[model samples]
Target chain A: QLPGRLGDPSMSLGTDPRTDPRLAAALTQLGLADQAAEPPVNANSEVADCIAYSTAAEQAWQTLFAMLGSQGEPSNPVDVREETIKGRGGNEIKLYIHSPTGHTSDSDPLPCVVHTHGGGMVILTAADANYSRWRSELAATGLVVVGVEFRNAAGALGNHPFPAGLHDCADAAKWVASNREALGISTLIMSGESGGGNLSLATTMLAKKEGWLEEIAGVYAQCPYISGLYASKPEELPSLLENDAYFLDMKTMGAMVKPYDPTGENASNPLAWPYHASLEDLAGLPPHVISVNELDPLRDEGLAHYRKLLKAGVSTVGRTVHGTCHAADCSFVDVIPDVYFATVRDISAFAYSRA
Target chain B: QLPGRLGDPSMSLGTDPRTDPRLAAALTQLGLADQAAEPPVNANSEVADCIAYSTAAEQAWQTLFAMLGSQGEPSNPVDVREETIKGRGGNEIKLYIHSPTGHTSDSDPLPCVVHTHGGGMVILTAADANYSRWRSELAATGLVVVGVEFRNAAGALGNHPFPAGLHDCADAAKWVASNREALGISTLIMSGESGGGNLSLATTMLAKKEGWLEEIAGVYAQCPYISGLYASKPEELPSLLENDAYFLDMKTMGAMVKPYDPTGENASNPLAWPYHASLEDLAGLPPHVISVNELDPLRDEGLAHYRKLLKAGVSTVGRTVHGTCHAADCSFVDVIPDVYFATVRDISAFAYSRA
Candidate 1:
């Protein structure tokens, strides 16, 4: 209350002094900087309302992304192929596989990344330009990248919840590891941002439980949303309150997940919210790199999970990318290229380091 | 140029996303965020213009600082005494000595810090609220702090260039070390920020030259303005261009030093800038700590010196205070108490470690 904008109740990335100037500029250019924090759809509201809000948010993101141009062809080209596979429970899942053009199954294999897109597992699509561009960007770094189109609990890919998306992601990882030679990958690492980050970590936990833990070389989770306690305002995760509306807010976060677990019976299920994972669930897992954005509301949750991994004796690296909001490392490639490429290189390096 | 505010031609701490949020808020609250960058007075301009400009800037700073309340006494009490002494050139100087109450010469002696206030050694005063509070704050942390009121090269203390200020500072340090028992001190360390940082480092260089290197236990330089390359845009120190107008502008820095060396004859003199200190000049002085502010134009110069110190086989510690502008670690103590006390504790710790 005494200092300046640091104490301002309505501060966002655009107005926050601690945000990277490059990031602030990108937000302004996209006309997203001035947006007020939207009141979240009530978590207790009817599923219909949550579904509608989730769809609207996705559409708005698509509109904003259209300004960045076609994702069909980037300046640096990567070979992308789509494959349909049967997931757990016999549901069909689509995987967008990206690789460097010059490499093939006959060439020396590269480390592969199994990417799950963000949307709190409730909205957004792997096919969205933002995520597609990310896969291509990673693939261009001389690695194979597989983007899993998991089922959402709301929006166009709606009505599935909890283990549904997690199961799909786990199935995708197994398929990649099983076909590592044909996919031209020496090893497999899983990575994603936000809800995707949740799926990424959960997939590993699923692997450990399902006795396929050795298949994943490592996991890199960025700005993960795995707490399932957004509505509770838990004292442990202070960033939720400190950075409440600085790009992402708690109410919206709470509302997004309501559809993901409609009945709340799995509230503390380790499969649903990996933040609830016991040390026993994490031990014997592969190496992990938990990268968090400093200004993101989900910052602390990712950190909390990282510490848990450490206590479990899992090899882990925790990175706090200062001056950034949620998911900034993978977003805004054209702007803040230094920061963008840094994360890209780190993720790539981490993948190869294990390989 | 492609990104939004990140690529803005004229950006400052207020608009720079990389700045700490609390720091940005403090700048905004001070009504300083919106002020346009003043064109640096030409380095080649008449000494009279440099002197006049320096005086004006000091007056404005004093006016701004007045809003922060009195320095006569702060909430946390520390015993303060002023000592007047004769210096090297028979010039009179004042030392604002501060120590914790009830610590007498009969008590176990405490570490002492000989501090030279910042202002490019051309403006500001040892008595200013900004600097005085710093001494009191350090003293409150159990170290005896002596604020040197050496004759400045410009302003109310005018036109005493080159070695004039340096001589006064060295004389005061010797006095502190010689009278350590009466002053209730066990060891002595020299510390300062900006131009004062230059003096702190240079004093040790002088000590080594004068065969009194054993007097000072250590040296801590904060956001040192020792390059004297403000006009050259040296490629080695890119922060000068990258953060040129982020609170402390290069041109303003260049202008301030004009009076400190009116003829430019001593431009590369180590005694003048310290950035010019040869490896030989730095060898065997004392343990040193170079603490730089990330958003300050002078950041790299301090870093460059740290590297040189390492090469010279001197014991040194280098710190980059991320998300801060020039001298932010000491300024805005009320707004950013966390950062303020961190530096205070560090300086105090470094002092005692040597003791």
Candidate 2:
């Protein structure tokens, strides 16, 4: 749409997208709590501008992976490895396998979680495997964490929308089950963080319908972006009203999701947005742990989905950490180990208990 | 008015009031998760029978307390004290103070949490001030936990109805603040578990109005009960619709809260129910931590209230533990230290971060 141009250094994604008065107090509130971050400064409000921004942001992220390498830190506790897997439509996607140290070759293996990273679907970041300390804490429990580099939604204009990462994640997740014996994995956990939570969920719906849920120990989603698929500024969604705050706001979210479905028609592809899943699909979901920050814009989606799962009689549990903003998912786990790990601990607990 | 009658053993408060089809699957679902109790048997659903049952239940609690004495264990890790405080309408109430083991007299102060015992207003058991392990853990964080013995709603025909415990908790909480220096306390936290959770919310509303929120560090509510004051059944209310598996069900809760407002007019008194508090009041309250049992009947209210607080821009956090029933506040704190203490740790994290 932008003629494949890289981000304009001169072009500024203006403040209108993040400057709603409703969000003014929430952003300041984040500051008072000292959990503040700059507004998602790179966001664009208009679709054409968003299309351009997405192109630029994706380019930046690609450049970042090139420089930093496509991996979490080398010393990352979970033993990391790269593998090539065939995702949907025979598209070979890169997948990462992170197994607990010392359990890979054993006769009895560990439980595994197929995790999808959050990038609002259009982009990818190494932080998808966020340099979170929870990784090691999880490995200690003898669990495996695996991720698929699903073909992200397109940044280029001609790239029509579909569930780009949906089947990629599903195929990779099911493939991990192949190591069932050596990993000693009695069950598999389906997990995703942030926007990947949405992707993971969409993939999960597919997985459940495909009967992969029988092996699923649980589904873990953190600050997932689900409800905003159509909601621009619904009164029920309070987080969108918060002013320039950490990580997200309504319009900023709007920009990120724009490229995921430019025409916005693919959202009805229940496999693309799990919210479209039939009640039966939701009812059969694995036990879930939906965690979110009290101040995050994605908070309501996760909470609302959890209720739907509960209403459908799925064993669902929800967690929210108070006082902090979205970044607490990153900021607190390392700085405030106790409270943060309590969350990580619970996610692990939910999966294992069901396992 | 049952003429001050005790219970009619012959009257078996029939199943209609107790039996609702919506909850049938939920109770069984808990059993499928196998996280269930033997059912709250000995419960009477009839108005008259419940009145009598309430009387006997209270009598048993009173007798047990008299024999056990009204104090935490002498060897308890925290220093315990009892004082007489005049609550609303000049009602003399008993207040229990739990100061950390070492901070009794010295200048180095600890933070404090004004806690209300969990009771459905009609009953008081030792568990209300139940001296459990989390108490010492809380104190060890250099905090104090204080509670009040508000008059339980009466079970007798002549028993009056009002927010007896609500005002009592508020007054005692305010009273404790006066001794801040002597007790070596730097901050105050408002907390309640289960039934006390409901009471504390009402008390919190009052405290915020009286401008006592300045010294308050946080509010902690666990497995709170709020929305069931009206309407017998609603499909959307999954918790209220659950059958007799955990400690509470619609019938049991109805019996418990019936005496709280015999005329049922008090629920309309907005201040009497925190759910009824104006958005402004809820917004002005301090930071919060709401924890619930995934299998508990009170789960929805805590989750629902957390959303409301977040919507009002009040800092709110929420947590839920799966495979557990209603008694996690008592049963699991000691049994599952890691998962449970993390809750206590975070509550401290919330308040002391402010401290």
Candidate 3:
């Protein structure tokens, strides 16, 4: 339950996972798992056929999720709106606002959570889906939630990237900090998922440099991807080339690496790689929470970072979801089950402590 | 939902996901969102360092997971034992048995569920973690469960490899079928997760080939990862060279592909790639369940296969966990929350129908 690395099971990556009943039902209902392959690629598959089927499925399903997404909307009683802001380098970006609809902070100022959606710097919108969830969280905490749509947005492609997004986030923080009176915010906390989480940390680092840390309340980086080869160590292993976690496997991870530090020399620099940032520098950080997925590749690094944060005597606290890979809540909340919901509770609880 | 592809939210691959409360908390916590290099390499990441951090993490976590593992034993009340069977090419293998501790069929023959654990032929064991989950499933169903430790099992590496795992599964089915009376098995069903799901399907196909179709009652395969690149399509997307899903990236996926199909020729061969198998071949599959996580890369393919199965006239049913990626419930049930629990209820319902 403690936020540090050494004695936590949830924080520990996996060797085992519990069996899921829903998974059982799925197996039986799907009838035949024919599409599954057993033969070796030991060759190559026809991209054309794979695409032929998937492309149609994609178009068909896109329409479906839209309809099923009526699947319903957020049930939390929170209001959402888009706020246009001047991002880094003057790029205009929209910040999504999730505030308790009827529970306005007319008299007393409320804590504000400056959030960023995940995508490892690739594009994954800070849109409605995420907004709805923020509504759910804020519904409980009744805190004002501002989601930054990081700049130079490119989906999956990672092209046209960085400081723009980072700068966008930092600017958003400044905007929130400056307008805290109008926004009715009392405290400013930084947060994000994956790259967004990384950016959240970077934003804080930026804020600290800009004299912003003093005004900040806390930081939450769930499954943040903070370092790469440069600062990574050679741990002994009984291993293979396992794509242990998903959504940003090592290969894709490697590619995403350069975008942060193209020269490769600074991949591990704390100014860039927040986890690699020294604890002394992280010392002034407000209270924070860091979550990790047990089966994810980033698990250990995250736990280690948490340990470092605690070692630095920062008022940090959090929980880690076990048996899943990368961002249990980042995107897979509804399915991964308890991890996401619990994370929300943890964050809310953490925020409440300071609020 | 009906198993066919056309219009299902859970079945759809991507585009939008319902918000998750947990992700919201994480965004508000991490503070920075940088390692998210946006400048696209349209390129590659170094493999050595990629594995570097992961390697140490792996070794450290192995010790950690192993320790945290007893972490305790399966709490579900069920009896477990190992049954040896002739595997692919007559290799000896163990079939893990799970059944209600006191309800051994003396007068009544119980329904049987042949399950396989996931690992994609690399390795993961039938450790207590898995056993506990199976115990819960069987405890309620009062069914006899048999889990095959597919191959030279080990989670750390993919060395001993391939068809051996799938074959072992098929043979296990045969052995179970032949010894149904002694094992007190009445109805024969199959289930598994990820690669286990893949093997579960291949086993069905192999059984069908050996004229074993008439006896099977149902099949449940959750988030099965069948193909890509060689078998992948151009399902247009605003991409990231994106590893797509987490836990396993493309390269790791590639290596896993080889151990199964080594020469690289039959990548899409049904024997190797079950999804690539023709509908005609899949025609008589017993009533089945195919579950998908909306955010997974395997989404489109899984849905397409579901569509094909329905067209083939199988009485198939499917469920998709929206707002999540591959194996959401497969691993993080305690936190992914309701999804896993609901999935259990669903699987039980399906099993009861067959029973």
Candidate 4:
């Protein structure tokens, strides 16, 4: 049988609220009477618990974060602007645009990078601590990093599932291309990890159909989920079903993809799962750089997509980092430093070459 | 208005009845009275005359059959076997199998080649003289060439079209694979020219889905018609539409593809026309060798499919033979000497390497 909390919907897990005085005070300041609020619409209850869990998760990584201090952030500060666009299904989507200050060229145009965050479609954000390192690293390369805070599951945004999220990303890309002059960027690129990586690939396919590929320089999808239909191998099931230790687990995975499964159609739909997209459509689109972690559930899918890209006549390079799982770049600087920094550098180089 | 003989229903412009007196007499013995009987069925007598005029439009090269001065009917000479298979919708599918002796390694398992003939879909088999050259070449490589005499508009088999023909070809491939021992073959490969190339590719997609690709070696499609829906370009339309003296005119082209029109749902069905087949389906399938003629009407489509194959991660090698039109190798061996003997050598080398 599973643990009691696993079946208890109301139960919360993480650090004890009473033990941390400072955190308890912060929760009180946020209008919480205690860690737990009374009855319906308890802002302090759910929200406070979420914040506390996030804090605990962050605290657990204090040492790792210290080591990655300036390695992830851009050496040169970048100015970011909040922007919105009308996405597919007539939903207004939000995104952030990061630009290098006072960076201009008379001979060529500056490149733009659209950065996506990963949480298996359930949690995390472009502004999450895990992505701060990538944001800074990418921004340091003179690229305009547009970190997208797409809608997540279990929120007011409902299920911001595939194709829907993918559509919004494409809309954002079109907006970027159409307003390139205003943004002062000549080349466009999409980069992300995990779910974000999936979005990066999905957006590439859409861009190809819309004839926007030529305007785009490249795509960097780190451990993208290409196929969802096949169950993990028997030996892999345990880790995939394990708790919040490393893998996302079956429950979270289901919730993450539920938004895109409303029709109950095959998960291999190219629109919903860009990893399964036709290689022909990808041909002549753009160069791509994909990274995979050896232990990640998405490792095979990412590698498969990479192989397809190479076969389809696209210039591509893929690397598999050892001793890592999904989004391993976020855990520590030393474990896979090259995976993070090299991707950003390569993306910058590809964009510059295209420009 | 079109000229009286120009629009004769009984005529077929490209096929010359006077070429081989014996083959002509044989055709007559088979109940086809002269070349006029090629398009046996017509909606009206006037249309019949028009068809006849088109059939006899130009006397290109005389059909010749020479008995080689070898003992006992050219010992182990290539055998062309015509078999009929029952297809979906209870249609009769006539297919040809070419078996030749004296390949490189008789001790090794023999490979099967399911060869599809080319045309728009309407041209008669005899009209595609180049197919014989390809057949001989492939046979020399130790592959049993199963030439699909699928339903064509100009023949008695015209009623069953499109998906029927494509499906029938796939069925024939299955039959060959299932009875490999009796057929004296170990594996299967698919090859075709023009319309047959389309069928070959479509059959490949189906084979991949049915798990038949596991039993097949690869596919070789020469001058395939990939973009069935796209009309001829302006520059190509003149040459394509010209009358008898123009070689392959629009009239003959229309006749060829008329039988393969996806009248209703067939257009979107991947089995009927493989261009719409998903790229993911092509992954992990057999390697492909595609050759295209720069001056052929189907050049662009061939190029498009070749690119698709590359993107799908299917090992593919392609060449666009300059100064060659459709079936040029048949009329003038020098135009594409490589199409015959060289192709056999290349295919054998590629197949052997893969093995």
Candidate 5:
């Protein structure tokens, strides 16, 4: 129904007709529509080359998210707290916990969602205005929400990579489980988008390896960037070619993988890229909901991971949000309110439905 | 949104909530709702074990399609004729030609769709009541339509397997092309559903091999049953497991393959199962439209073939018709009329659009 280039595979996010009109109009209104067409800063380069790229990328995201975050109505009242803890590696980690007001130690414990932020596990932070607003909105749904600030591979949180970020996330999750009683939370579910989605799933795999799998009840990963094959643009994952530059292109995404796996030897590591997880690593994991956007280059990888979970006999629900780009459910909240809240409601429902 | 088992993976076509409600209600009314739940007749048995099964299946289809075909209003006026020709293997082939009424040799030439009917290439005939009605309806759209009656591996047409059927199809298409001027058709497009979908694609491969590839202008395959891995039910095609018994199950379908490839030696032959077709076999072929039903067990195979076509650098359009079972566009015509007609329009449009 969209005219001309909007529906063509060759079109970018700015002109792709498959994008929701409201989101497209708002992106142009906010002067962020051109970002999708921006050229890659440092593609197929060494780790040091990407460090500067990540720093610039993070600054751009901060400014862009700030504009969109401020356009939306202010978040609802919630009790928010931040805690600093020492990771197993002796590094400092920040944990942000948000709960609905009026809850007390005497009240019945509710389900808790442990959140991870997206930046391909290399950039961005849980404390970013957009991510902070998201956690607050989720907490306002009468459940407890916790956001973990793990070490990044590049940008301000730099110099740490792979197991460093994974370990920090696992440590934060264990901390929540160790203090469940005082936290007024009965269950813990791992949840995040994009890079954080990678960490959300990888952390659960890490828990399985370390013998605390029972501490997590479920996982909800949206448009997960788990395949480390961006550089190769393999034929198996056609979305990498079909929706290549719709919103996120391979060169820009390929640059992020370099920092996460500086030696490039961990491309096949299951912990670094959950798409490589074997049946042994996936089996016996808790229920999962792998949600993907129809127009994301990362779409097929999420679906492939979902298929593997089903093959492993894990309870899994796979869904696609048609006519949207990567992470649209979590982003573009002000204009596409219905889609944004539907995901919020689904995640809340999934958290509540699980034990 | 219907309650309970309607939405579960464990539910059958009779109970699966993903099936179109109108189609479900019609199936129940037509008394064909229990067919999906029937036990396999001769699963994993020898070729002899399947001849009787195919005979019974053919009879059941004849009766079922007779009743349903009679339920819909008679098709629009069209000129119909049958011609007999000698195939490469010295077998007699029947070609049914349908065209809009009142078109003479002097009329402006229109696009022609050379059609094949679905039956796993082992059973079912193009002369079936449903296929006859479908061809006639397509001809009513101001285009020429020809249905091929190639030799079958089982049922009334018996024992001619593999290249026997493929050769007959290619010969029929060649006949259409050789007489294009006399037939008043400006273009030739190969089109079919299910097993016929396999032949529509495979015949093109055969044409390419025979150096007559230029005779075909385009292809439109729907819910193609091309992958011959039913017996293995391989993990790579997860829909074979996820939608195992939705309407078609693996065991019963696996039985059909035995008759088509009696020795099972041709399982990987690109000509026998177009899913195995290589890039060299596909390159330089015409455009294609691979349409799949969301709820069919054959959905993923059709999608995989679409991806392969794209990889071969062919101009391809991939589509999924959500909330329907296998072959819904060609079946359930009375209740789901819109979907059935939309496909008819699309096929006709595709034929006309090609040079």
Candidate 6:
């Protein structure tokens, strides 16, 4: 085993170099001689770059989460109500609506934010510890946080899962807008982390087309894996596997994405993957703020998307935090306590700044 | 108010010149002024001559129990099970399964029929008096009848209503196929009445394209209104107004059909209207049997479809009963007591024969 925990090993931590010549040779073949000299790609060391170089980043991340145990129940600062919305396939989907109590006035228009959970479209939820960190932080802005629980891949729902989930989220947003008075929502913003970030961007595209953006205020996506096709592009493979020891790799990433859209027919569909959407289509979308992890494999893709939004004349802002991997914001509580809370403060300030 | 329903002696039954000018004008227009006056396009009165002009006719006739409503519930010889299935847009859809027990010794393969209820796609379960009559009759043929209570157009899960319901039914069919041993469904067929018939045909097209036809045995449709565009077709409008007494007419029919597909974009789409499907596409479809009511506005459209099916080289059968309006077979139990029941028997026999 590698470093801190039973499974958390840096790619540069452990390995019996003398007896395990084959392992040494494999690492040498991958030009990962330094990583193989230790343990594997993990939370520490330059070998963590494997996550950015390998295609199995999804699997590696999942394995890491499985070992650390789940992030536990989500913490809600505001009064939250659990609502069930009907999905396009007539399946009931659960959504969490967080409405801040003790408003200053009855007629005040409450700002709404739809939060999507991320797991490469396969796993993850709003209640997960990772998402809760962001939710609690964002809730401080006094904005209504609506967490959408869309049908994930491998959940009895059939293949071609993208727009199905995205469409449902759009419907949920519309539902929130139509019932804004009851929920005290006026301006709506869509947001999410990782896969959810991708979904947030996608939902925005659908919202724009369906005239929902006219009522929506903006979109806030944090480190979204925007382009699956580009993520799987040959040039990006090496960086994707850099953090293999962290428990996600190219193989698992492929598996996670396959269930959402095995054929990739919808990989280019704007409602499913907005990164594949044309620049003209992105022009009328609500203003957006996207955050990226500097060391994450998906960093380049997220940056490319931010640029596209900028080029399309959409008011856009992007921030790349240095020295962090995917979902590093969640681990900030332990790794860099003060900075973690500071990041949360930054998000809240961003959410309420324009208002 | 019309002459019959409203108490107005000035309106004569048929030929009083001053009292019933409309009736006289109708008869004169049909060149039936010298003969006994009848509804426009009376099939029986001109059957011999019309048969020569017709391109196709029903090849066979079958019968079922004439007075089955006389039996009590437990002793009714029909086993009915109510189940809830996952619907599109996350709704719970109720389905009724009817099977005639003691017919098979648990060794033979039993045929299945997914019967969709009709209300122009806007109404709920057709477990009302007429549907129960048809279901009870169809169950007598030792076939399994699955009645789907699909989500309606005005419900919460109304968006994309047609394809949503279609996909739900298709999933149910696939579920039945996969769970054949447990459910006693070895072979499958699709049948519907009115709007349900439209759904039946639409699902058949989707199933075939989605590779579900491999498991489906055949399709049996009754008085299906295929096209919303045909609602105002010249030939259908006059009879539609005359037969306005029936709950289904051009006005109500338009209201229901329009909501399910408001834009009417799929009026020509094969999956929405199989009769509009191309000849080449109809090659591998299972055998079909379509029934029509002579006095119904849909009579001509159904016959037109019958001709199209024949020209496409697909095996098809059409039967039109005279003096009956739309759903008339289910209305007057006394007039043609076994007619609707026999229609069910014919559908079962045809589906089982092919299987």
lDDT of 6 by residue, A1-355 (tens): 2112222334431232111222234334434334322223322223223323233334454444433224332233456668897766687877776656564236476667778877766655555555554564556557777878776654323233566778777878777778777776667777877778888888878777777677667787877866665335445333344343322344445445555665568767766666666888898776777776634556556766775776576766555543345655544343333234434544544455334
lDDT against the true structure, each candidate = 0.80, 0.58, 0.56, 0.54, 0.80, 0.57
Question: If ranked by TM-score, best first, what sequence of candidates would result?
Answer: 5, 1, 2, 3, 6, 4
Candidate 3 lDDT for residue B118: 65
Q: Given candidate 1, what's the lDDT at residue A29?
A: 79
Instruction: Give the lDDT of residue A190 in candidate 3.
Output: 84
- TM-score of chain A in every predicted structure: 0.95, 0.76, 0.76, 0.71, 0.94, 0.74
Q: List per-candidate RMSD values in Å.
A: 18.7, 13.0, 19.5, 22.8, 18.1, 30.1
Compared with the true structure, the alpha-carbon lDDT of candidate 6 equals 0.57
lDDT of 1 by residue, B1-355 (tens): 3111225766767776556666677788776664347755867778789888887788887776655424345445798899999997788899999999887899889999999988888877888888888898899878899999988888777668879889999999999989988999999999999989999988889999999989999998988989898877888776777787777767777788788988899998999989998988888878887888867778878877876886676766556665677887777776655456557766876787677
- lDDT score, candidate 2, position B224: 80
C-alpha RMSD over true interface residues, each candidate: 13.6, 8.7, 14.7, 22.3, 13.1, 36.4
True lDDT of residue A312, candidate 4: 69
Clashing pairs in 1: A5-B25, A19-B17, A20-B17, A21-B17, A25-B4, A25-B5
Residue B49 in model 4: lDDT? 45
lDDT tens digits by residue: candidate 2, B1-355: 1100012212111211221112333334334323222323222345456556677666654453333233334233666677787776887877666666666657577678777766566676423334333455566556777766677676432244556667777888888778887767778888777777777777777777788767666777877877644335544455654523344545556666666676667665655556555667787787776777655666666776776776676766566644345645343332333344445555665556556
Docking class of 4: incorrect
Error of 1 at A179 (Å): 0.2
User: Which one wins on DockQ?
Assistant: 2
Model 2 chain B scores worst on lDDT over the 10 consecutive residues at B1-10
The C-alpha local distance difference test score for the whole of candidate 4 amounts to 0.54
lDDT of 4 by residue, A229-308 (tens): 33333332222322122233332344335444544474667766666777786778676767765445465567667657
TM-score of each: 0.53, 0.53, 0.44, 0.39, 0.54, 0.40
The order by descending lDDT is 1, 5, 2, 6, 3, 4
In the range B279-326, model 3's lDDT, one tens digit per residue, is 877878887677766445565555555545665656554445544445
Report the lDDT tens digits of candidate 6 across residue range B1-355: 2312122322222332211123234334534333222222222223232222211111100011123233323224877778787754676777777888754436476778888766556544445545665676677666777877666554333434456677777777766667677667667888887777778877877877887688777777888877664345454333343333332334434444555655557667766665577777677777676776644556556655654665565555555543344654543343334344335445666556555
C-alpha RMSD in Å of predicted model 4 compared with the true structure: 22.8
